[PDB]
Every structure is written in C-alpha cells, then in structure tokens.
Design a protein around this ligand. Structure first.
Ligand SMILES: CN(C)C(=O)Oc1cccc(N)c1
Lengths: 237, 300
C-alpha cells in the first residue's frame, strides 16, 4: 500500500527496498526562437534510485540523446525510468534485488508495474510523503557528473557518506531529508550554511562536509531555521 | 415459433423472457410461454416475489430440444428441463394452448431489439462459458463469479469468460512495454482475435452475452467483462473498420435497452468517458456517443 507517516520505520527494516524518483529524468530549458516562438532544449537528467537503509544511490544518468526524434517526452520519461529500474533490478544478484520499490510520484506506478511483470514478488508502492529528492541536482558533485556525461552512464554513490558508522539509518535518512528540503526551499541559503565556514572540507570520496557530531547538530539546527523562515517569507508569518 | 410449457406456478414470481417480463401470482393457472421466435437464443428468468435476492434464469435455443419449466420445492427454484419424448411434449403443449394457459412472446413486428442484442450470441459458445454439459440449456444467476474473479471459489459454478488483463504478460510483449500498454492493438488483434476468439464474431458474441447477464441478473463479474471487452477495442489504435462500425451498433442497442434506473450500477464512468472522449476510437462510435449523451449525460 501507500507509504506515509504511519509506517515510516519500515524504511529501515531489513527487507531490501529502493526509492525511485523520476523528477530529474527529463529536464529542459525553455527559450524563444528567432521567429519569436517558444522551444525547449533538453539537458542531461538522472534517475535517483536510493536504498534508504544503506545509503546506496544508483544514479542513472539520462543523456539527451535518448530523446532525439521522440514525441511526448514527459510520458516517455516515465517509461524510460521504468525500463532503467527494471534493467537495474535484473542486473543485481537475486539476494540483492529489492522486495519493494517505492516511487515518489504516482504516475510512475503503471510504467514500473508493467516493466516489472517478470518480478511478481516485488511490490511497487506509492507514498504520501512529499520527499525532497528533486533537490539532488543541488548537490554539486551529483550535478557535475550529470552535466558532464557524454553518453548514458550509471554512477554509484553512498548519499550518507560515512554517517552510518556513527548514526542509525533512521537518523541518516532524517538528516538527508532535512538537508534536501532546505536545498529545495532556498538553495543559496542552504549552500551558505553548509560551506560558509572555510575550515570544514568535503572528502574527495564524499558528498557532504566532514562535520563533527556537534557541528551536525548546529548545521541541522540552521537548516530547520531556514525551512521555517522561508515558510514565513513565503506565507508572511 | 416454439413453446416453453410450465408444469405449474406454485410461487409468486416475476418471469422474464428476453427483454419482456410479467407477474405470476401464487398458484395462478400459468402454463408457459408460446410463439417464441425461432432463430435466436433466448433467456427465461425469474425473481421470486418473496426474495428479490437471486435473479436467476436459463439460456436456451428451441432448435436444440424441447424444454419446459417445473418448480422444485426442495431446491426452491423454477428449473428448466428437457423432455426427450417428442409426442409427449407436443401433446402437453397442444392441450395448454387449447386451454389458452400460455402467454404469447410479445414481439412487435417492426422491433429488431432482441436480434440486435444477440446478433453474435450462439448457444454453443454460451455452453463453453457456462459449463454443465449434461444439459442443452445454461443456468446463470446474480451471484455466480467469473474465472478471473476466482483468481483474485467453486469452479463448477463459474462463468468462464475469456480473461482480459491489461497489466499481464499476455498483454505486454517483452520490450514493447510502453507501446503495448498505451496501444493495445497487439493484444486485441494478435492475442485475442487471431489467437483466442479466432474472429470478431466470437468476440462480439461474448461481449453481448456478458452485457445480457449484467443487465438481466445484475451479475457484477459479467459487467466487468463487458466493460473490459469494450475498453480493449477502444484502447487499440488499429482496429478493422468493420469491427468499429459493428461495435457502435452493438453498444447503441445495449444502451438503448438498459433500464434508465440501473445506469448507476451497470455503467462504469471511467471506461465510458475514456472510450468516448480520450481513446483512439473516441471519434468512431457516433451512434453510441449520441445515445449516451442524450440519455446519460450525468455519467459524463
Ligand atoms: C412435463 N410438463 C410439461 C408437464 O408435466 O405438464 C403437465 C402435464 C400433465 C400434467 C401436469 N400436471 C402438467
């Protein structure tokens, strides 16, 4: 069934599961033509496929060539997403395949379900949560690998860096969702918070700064302030 | 013109014969129905006055035998039976006609309704959907479930309609996932028409039979089947032109005949709005769209 606030701890049990977000698969800039009409130019995108328990991120880069000569691209994007997720599952050993795939947008249910007909024991589920995974292209290293791609490419990351050595996956997911919510609500401010101090670095093999436990509390506190504010600046309160 | 003799009418019952119906009182001197047109299947159906629960009835074709109705007080229903003794039957019928104990199948001469509702329905195909091979006629009632319903429980008492499922390996060619899901022509023309039904007449016959069981018995699984068979054609970009023209005629007469007060349960809003306004064939059902818009504009 649908994933919501009530069954949130299920994300961190020992049944393998993946979130799939398709927001950033088909991306365009809209511009004027010489004749004064409007046209779109596509840019590279990505499927965001995340194991919330382990932090393993399967980032399938979608190169603009996959749209050449195709119609109804927003619709095709959902089926392309489902085809790539299906290909990913088939590439994993049986004992690594997910038992559930949770899609962040309901329009992905039927495309994924049809592509996964071969896997009747994998549950395809929606969610009621408003998860901020679109903001993954606000993470600099992830954006950089997507824009530089010259061909289809899968890139593997751990979106939690080394956090699981010190915190649980519940706490790591909550940190991730807070960082991404902040980046989505006010990217510039959020990015100021994370690196305005020049002595805290991002390791070459990591995505986020090497904060101590105490600095993470400060950082997390600053992100919640941002989110509350912008919610005022937005609604005037 | 043939006759179906009733042994008696011991319980008050509304009797249907095709799209006609009449009331019979407890122990009324009623001995059957005469002047039944040859050349068509027919259905004779029952709703007891005391228990509107369970509409039930029998599909039959008088060319296949001499059939009569006799009430069974143990099982509590009117049962169809075959009389194998031809001279016994003729003598039975002639006596009741002489005593004018029978109602007349009341067909208006201009009226093609029943032909138009049963054009492609054959008894031999009914008997494969309703399996009871010791009889030449077929029992159906409001509660019988379909094979597909059982998968989602008595196999002997099921409606064995052709299983249609748009998210199934039969419907979706590996590697044509998006193509086959958004344009069901493969599934309609290759899997179902060429593979399973053999021709469109058998397809239309099952569609018509499913509608009639939905209308006369309120059979929910039959209504599901009728809508699924409509949707499979409407959701196909490539349909033979003769099939579309015949479908429009079929549906038109079904909508024409439907009780105005049953449209709330017998018509699926989603299927009809999709078929008439969003599907590949949205512009191919002129007669059906005009009668639906003038008779059930609320649904849409
Ligand atoms: C088989 N049916 C048609 C039948 O028994 O009809 C009659 C004939 C004779 C007596 C009575 N009771 C009814």
């Amino acid at each position: 069934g649908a994933m919501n606030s009530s069954n949130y701890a299920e994300l961190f049990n020992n049944d393998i599961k993946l979130f799939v977000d398709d927001t950033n698969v088909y991306r365009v800039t809209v511009h004027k033509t010489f004749e004064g009409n409007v046209a779109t130019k596509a840019i590279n995108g990505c499927i965001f496929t995340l194991n919330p328990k382990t932090g393993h991120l399967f980032l399938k880069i979608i190169h603009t060539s996959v749209w050449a000569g195709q119609k109804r691209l927003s619709q095709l994007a959902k089926w392309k997403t489902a085809e790539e997720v299906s290909a990913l599952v088939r590439s994993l050993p049986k004992e690594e395949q997910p038992k559930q795939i949770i899609v962040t947008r309901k329009a992905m249910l039927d495309p994924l379900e049809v592509h996964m007909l071969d896997f009747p024991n994998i549950a395809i589920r929606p969610t009621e949560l408003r998860l901020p995974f679109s903001a993954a292209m606000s993470i600099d290293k992830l954006s950089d690998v997507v824009m530089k791609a010259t061909e289809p490419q899968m890139v593997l990351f751990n979106i939690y860096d080394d956090w699981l050595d010190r915190i649980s996956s519940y706490t790591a997911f909550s940190r991730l969702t807070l960082l991404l919510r902040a980046l989505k609500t006010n990217e510039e401010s959020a990015k100021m918070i994370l690196l305005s101090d020049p002595t805290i670095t991002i390791k070459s093999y990591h995505l986020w700064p090497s904060f101590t436990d105490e600095q993470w509390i400060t950082i997390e506190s600053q992100m919640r302030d941002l989110i509350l504010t912008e919610y005022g600046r937005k609604y005037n309160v | 013109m043939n006759t179906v003799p009733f042994t008696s009418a011991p319980i008050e019952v509304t009797i249907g014969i095709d799209q006609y119906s009449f009331n019979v009182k407890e122990n009324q001197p009623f001995h059957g129905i005469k002047d039944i047109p040859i050349g068509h299947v027919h259905v004779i159906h029952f709703q007891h006055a005391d228990n509107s629960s369970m509409r039930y009835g029998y599909w039959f074709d008088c060319r296949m035998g001499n059939f009569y109705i006799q009430y069974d007080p143990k099982d509590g229903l009117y049962k169809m039976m075959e009389e194998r003794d031809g001279a016994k039957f003729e003598n039975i019928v002639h006596n009741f006609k002489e005593r004018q104990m029978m109602v007349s199948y009341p067909k208006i001469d201009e009226d093609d309704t029943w032909y138009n509702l049963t054009e492609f329905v054959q008894m031999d195909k009914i008997r494969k959907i309703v399996r009871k091979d010791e009889n030449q006629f077929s029992y159906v009632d409001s509660s019988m479930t379909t094979v597909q319903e059982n998968e989602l429980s008595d196999p002997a008492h099921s409606l064995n309609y052709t299983v249609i499922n748009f998210k199934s390996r039969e419907a979706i060619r590996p590697g044509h996932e998006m193509e086959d899901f958004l344009d069901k022509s493969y599934y309609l023309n290759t899997v179902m028409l060429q593979g399973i039904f053999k021709n469109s007449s058998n397809y239309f016959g099952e569609l018509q039979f499913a509608f009639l069981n939905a209308m006369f018995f309120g059979n929910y699984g039959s209504s599901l089947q009728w809508h699924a068979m409509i949707e499979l054609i409407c959701s196909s970009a490539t349909v033979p032109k003769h099939m579309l023209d015949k479908l429009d005629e079929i549906l038109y007469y079904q909508i024409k005949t439907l009780p105005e007060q049953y449209s709330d349960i017998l018509l699926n809003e989603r299927v009809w709005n999709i078929c008439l306004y969003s599907s590949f064939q949205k512009n191919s059902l002129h007669n059906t769209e005009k009668i639906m818009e003038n008779k059930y504009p609320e649904l849409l």
